[PDB]
Amino acid sequence: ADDVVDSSKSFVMENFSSYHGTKPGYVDSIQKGIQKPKDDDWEGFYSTDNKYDAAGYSVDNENPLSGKAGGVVKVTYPGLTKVLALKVDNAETIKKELGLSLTEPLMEQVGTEEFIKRFGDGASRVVLSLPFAEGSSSVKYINNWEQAKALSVELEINFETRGKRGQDAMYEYMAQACASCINLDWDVIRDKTKTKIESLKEQGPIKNKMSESPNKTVSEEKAKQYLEEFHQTALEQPELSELKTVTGTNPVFAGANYAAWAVNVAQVIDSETADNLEKTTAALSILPGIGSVMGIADGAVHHNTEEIVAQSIALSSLMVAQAIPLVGEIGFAAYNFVESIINLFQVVHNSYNRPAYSPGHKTQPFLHDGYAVSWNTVEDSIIRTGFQGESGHDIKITAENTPLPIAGVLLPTIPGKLDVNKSKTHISVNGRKIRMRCRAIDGDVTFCRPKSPVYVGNGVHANLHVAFHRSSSEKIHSNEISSDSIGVLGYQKTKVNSKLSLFFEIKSMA
Amino acid sequence: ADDVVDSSKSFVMENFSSYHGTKPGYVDSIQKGIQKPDDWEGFYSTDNKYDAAGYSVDNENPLSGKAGGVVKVTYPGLTKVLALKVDNAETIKKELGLSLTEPLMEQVGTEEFIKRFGDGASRVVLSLPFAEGSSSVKYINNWEQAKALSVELEINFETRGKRGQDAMYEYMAQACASCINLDWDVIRDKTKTKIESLKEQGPIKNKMSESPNKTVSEEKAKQYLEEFHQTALEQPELSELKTVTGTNPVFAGANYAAWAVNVAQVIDSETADNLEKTTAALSILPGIGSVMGIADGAVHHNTEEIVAQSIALSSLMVAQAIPLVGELVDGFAAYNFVESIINLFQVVHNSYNRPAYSPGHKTQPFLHDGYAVSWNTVEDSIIRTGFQGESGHDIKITAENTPLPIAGVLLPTIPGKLDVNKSKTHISVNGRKIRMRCRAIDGDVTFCRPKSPVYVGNGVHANLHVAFHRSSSEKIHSNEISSDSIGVLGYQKTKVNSKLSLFFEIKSMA
Ligand SMILES: Nc1ncnc2c1ncn2[C@@H]1O[C@H](CO)[C@@H](OP(=O)(O)OC[C@H]2O[C@@H](n3ccc(=O)[nH]c3=O)[C@H](O)[C@@H]2OP(=O)(O)O)[C@H]1O
Ligand SMILES: Nc1ncnc2c1ncn2[C@@H]1O[C@H](CO)[C@@H](OP(=O)(O)OC[C@H]2O[C@@H](n3ccc(=O)[nH]c3=O)[C@H](O)[C@@H]2OP(=O)(O)O)[C@H]1O
C-alpha cells in the first residue's frame, strides 16, 4: 500500500475545492450539480488544482482547434475530504497493493464506505490525485461519480459571456498565470491588422507592384521570386515601419521566408478548406516556417507588441493574397487565414508563457550545429555542495549525420574548494573509454581534452563523465562561481569552436 | 548490503584471468610480475582484451604514437569477483559497514574483508561496468594481492612491425569477425601508387598549370578546387570513386573542396612537420565524413580500393589548396597528411564496428528535419507482453530553433490483443495537456491527431504519452506486428510528412 500511495502528498482538508473545464452549452447546467452523463477503472469526474489547466478543457469538442471555449467552474465538497495521491496510474497495480477486488472497477471501489473507512482518515470521502501531466506541476483529481453529487458548483469564468472573437477570452485568461509574459490585447491586434491591410493595398508602390503580377499560375520559382519582390516594396511602406526594423538582421525573418510561407499556404488551401475555419487551422497548423511570421526564433518571441504582431500578420495576409493566383486551387487571405493564424499565434505564445526548462537544462537537449547534447539524468545536472569528496556527472553527446568531432570540455573550478578529479573524468564513444588530459586555463576554468579523437554522428554517441572533487565541506557561494554551464567544444570553424552548453545548478544535500 | 552489491554478476572462479593494456616499453617488463610504481588505488584490468588494447598507446603521443600490447593475468586458485552497483567509495563503506577512514581498496586486501566477502576464495577482485555503452567490465585488484598474478603475453603490437597504429586497430577489428576489417597495408600502398600516377595524368597536369598558384580568396580557391575535383574524378585511378560518390550530396566535389580549404588553413610549417600536431589539428575539423564516405549511419567507403581512392583524391586537393590559402611545403599533402587521416579513418571505423543503439532505439535520440525525439527511458521503449492490461510509454519531442508542428503519431495495433487506450494517450506541450483523436488506418496501424495544435522548438518541448491495452494474455508473436517503430509525424512538405521514428522491442515480463 505504501508502494502506491505518496503519503507525503496526501492530506485531509475541509471545503476541498478544485476546478473543472466546461464546454459551450454546460457552463450553466453544470452549476445545478455534477451528474454522470448517460477503461472503466478510471471512470469518474475529473478536476484539477489549476484553473488555467481546467480552461484547456473548455473548447468545443466538435471544433477543438478553433471552436468556442465554454468556461471553468469551481467545485467544493462540504466537510472533510481525503486527497489520496498515487505514485502510479496502473489500476491493476493499485488494486493489488491496496487489497481491493481485482475484478471490480477501481473508481467504483474508491466510492464505497469500506474504502473510505480504510483510506479516508476520517474524511467523508476520498478523491484520488495524480500528476496532471509531464512538464506540469499541477495535479488531476479523480472523483467517484456518486460522491461527486455532494459538490457545490460555482462559476469561475464564462468565456462566452466575454463576447470576444475566436478563442481570445480563453488565451487572455490563461496569460494571467504569468501576470517573460506575453500578455497581448488581441482586440487591438485584430483592429490594427484590418486597418493596415486596407491601407497597405492603397499604397502607390504596392498598387504598382500589384499590377506587375503575372496574376496567373506560374512556377514556385517565379512565384517566390515575385513574392520576395512584393515583400520588399511592402516592407518599405510606413504601415510596416517597425516591422522593417525588427526583421532586418535575423535570417529567420527574411522576405524569402515570408515568401516561402505564402507559397505553402496557397498550395494546401482549396475551396472547401478556406470556407471552414476548423479545416483551415488543421491545414495551416501542420506547415513549417510559421516562426518567420510569428517572429519566434532562438528561444524567444521577438514580435511581442500588438503593433508589430499586427504588422507581421498584415504583411503575411497580403503575401498570401498575391500567391494564390500564382499557385492557388480570394477573400480567404483576409478572412479565415487571419482568424486561423491568430489562433496559432495564441497557441505558441501560451507555450512560451508556461514554465519550461530551456535547452541544456535538466534533461532537455541542447541542439546546435548538428550536435545534440544533454545531461543523462536530472541529478547529473546538479552539483551538490556542503561535503568533502566526489561526485560524477554524465552528459550524452551525439550528432545528426556525418562524424563531427568533440575537441574537449570547459569545466568550472573553485580555487581551494572545487576541482576536477582528473583520474575519473573521461569520455566514452560507443563503449570505447577515452582518457582525458585536463589543464587549468586559470583558477576558475579547466579544459579537458580527450587523449584520442572523439567523433559522434548517426550511430555514434558518447558519454562524457565529469568528476568533481570537493576539498572542503564548505557550501559553495554564488559569488565563488561565474559560469553556470559546462562547455563542450565541437568542431572548429577568427577561429571559434561550436559551443554546446550544459547548464547546472548548485544545491545543498538532501 | 544488497544495496551496493550485484550478486547476479558476482561469482567465484578458479584461475580467474583478465586483460591489461600495456604501454610501449613495459610489454616485457610487466610479465615479470604486477608491481606498483586512495580509495581506488589499485591495479586495473578488464574482461575484454580488445578494450584492454585501448589502453596501450603511448601516453605522451596518444593521437599518433605507438601501441604497446595486451597481457593476460591469471590468479591461481579461487577468486571472488565482487560486482558493485555504484562507484562512490564513501557510499560503499557505509552501506557495507566497513571503516570510513581506510581506503576501500586497501580494506579489500585484508583477511577480514576476504573472509567476509570471498565466499571461500583466496582474494576478492572488484568488478564495475567498464563504461557507458559497453558490455565489458573493469576489475580493480588490491596491489599486494596482485603479486600473486601470473602474467602472460596476449599480443605485442610493435612486434607486428606495422605502420602507424594499424596493428592495434586491426586487432580491435577482430571483435566483429557489418564489420569493417580493412587491410591498411594494402590501402597505404594503393594510396601512394594512385597519388603518383594521378599527378602524371595529362588533364591533371593541365589543370594544375591553370592554378593561380598564389594566395587568393577562398571563394576563388573553392571554385578552382571544384574544377580540379571533377577533372581528377574523370581519371581511371578514381573510376569507382566517381561512381560511389555521384548521388549522395555528402560526397560531392564541393565538400571535398571545403575540406581541402579548411586543411590548408590550419596547417602551419611546425604543425605539418609533426604527426601528433597534424592529427590534433585535423581532428577538430568538420566535414571529414565527405572523405571517409560516412553518412546516414553507414560507412559507405568500405573496400580497400575505394578508401585509397578517396584518400588519394583528398591528398591531391590539399596539395592544390595550400598555395591558394596556406603557407607550407606542399610535401605535407602526401606524407603526414596521409598518415594522419589514416589514423582518423581507423578511429571512426572502430566506432562503427562497436555495438551501439541506433537513433531512436532505447534512449538514443532520433535527429531529423530540425526535430529531436527519444524514448524517455529504456523501459518506455519496451512493449511488454504476456498479460492482460495497460502500459504507458513516454516519448520526448522538441526542435532546434523555430516552432515546428507535430501533426500526429502512427501507432501499432494487433487486431486481436493490442489496442491504443484512447483516453490515456495524450501529448503535453510545456505542461499543457492536449488530448488526441485516434482513428484506425487498417487493422494494424492507428493514427492519433492532437486536438489543439502542437508546436515544438527552442524552449518548447512535448511529452507524448502512448497507452496500450492488451485484451488477452497471449504473448505477441512476430507475425502479428509489421513495423518495429512508432511513427511521429512532423510538418508536411505529392504531400508527405516528416517522419520521426522511435523503435520499440517486444519482450515478455521479467
Ligand atoms: N453536470 C455535469 N456533470 C458532470 N459532467 C458534465 C456536466 N455537464 C457537462 N459535463 C461534461 O461531461 C464530461 C464528464 O464530466 C465532461 O466533458 P467531456 O467533454 O466529455 O470531457 C472530455 C474529457 O476531458 C476530461 N476532463 C474534462 C474537464 C476537466 O477539467 N478535466 C478533465 O480531465 C474528462 O475526464 C473527459 O475524459 P474522457 O471522456 O476521455 O474520460 C464535462 O465537462
Ligand atoms: N609491472 C607492472 N605492474 C603494474 N603496472 C605496470 C607495470 N609496468 C607498467 N605498468 C603500467 O603502470 C600503470 C599502473 O598499472 C599502467 O599504465 P598507465 O599508463 O599509468 O595507465 C593509465 C590508466 O589506465 C588504467 N588502465 C590501464 C590498463 C587497463 O587495462 N585498464 C585500465 O583501467 C590504469 O589504471 C591507469 O589509471 P591511473 O593513471 O589513474 O593510475 C600500467 O600499464
Residue numbers in the entry:
A (entry chain A): 2 to 39, 47 to 187, 200 to 349, 353 to 516, 521 to 537
B (entry chain B): 2 to 38, 48 to 187, 200 to 352, 354 to 516, 521 to 537
Quoted from the paper:
Protonation of key histidine residues has been long implicated in the acid-mediated cellular action of the diphtheria toxin translocation (T-) domain, responsible for the delivery of the catalytic domain into the cell. The function of the T-domain is to translocate the catalytic domain across the lipid bilayer in response to the acidification of the endosome. Remarkably, such a complex task is performed by this small 180-residue protein without the help of any additional translocation machinery. Formation of the membrane-competent W+-state occurs in solution upon acidification of the environment to pH below 6 and is accompanied by structural destabilization and partial unfolding of the T-domain.
In order to further analyze the putative pH-dependent structuring of the TH2-TH3 region, we crystallized a full-length form of diphtheria toxin (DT) harboring the H223Q/H257Q mutations. Notably, two crystal forms were obtained from crystallization solutions at pH 5.5 and 4.5. The first crystal form (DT-DM-A) was isomorphous with the aforementioned WT structures, whereas the other form (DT-DM-B) belonged to another crystal form. Not surprisingly, the mutant structures also form domain-swapped dimers and are similar to the WT structures. Interestingly, the TH2 helices in the mutant structures are well ordered in a similar manner as observed for the WT pH 7.0 structure and could be modeled on the electron density maps. Interestingly, the Q223/Q257 sidechain conformations are distinctly different from the H223/H257 residues in the WT structures. Concerted movement of Q223, Q257, and E259 in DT-DM-B results in the formation of new hydrogen bond interactions, as shown in Figure 4. Moreover, the acid-induced destabilization of the T-domain’s short helix TH2, previously reported for the WT, is no longer observed with the DM. The latter is overall consistent with the spectroscopic evidence presented above in Figure 2 for the lack of efficient conversion of the membrane-competent state in the mutant.
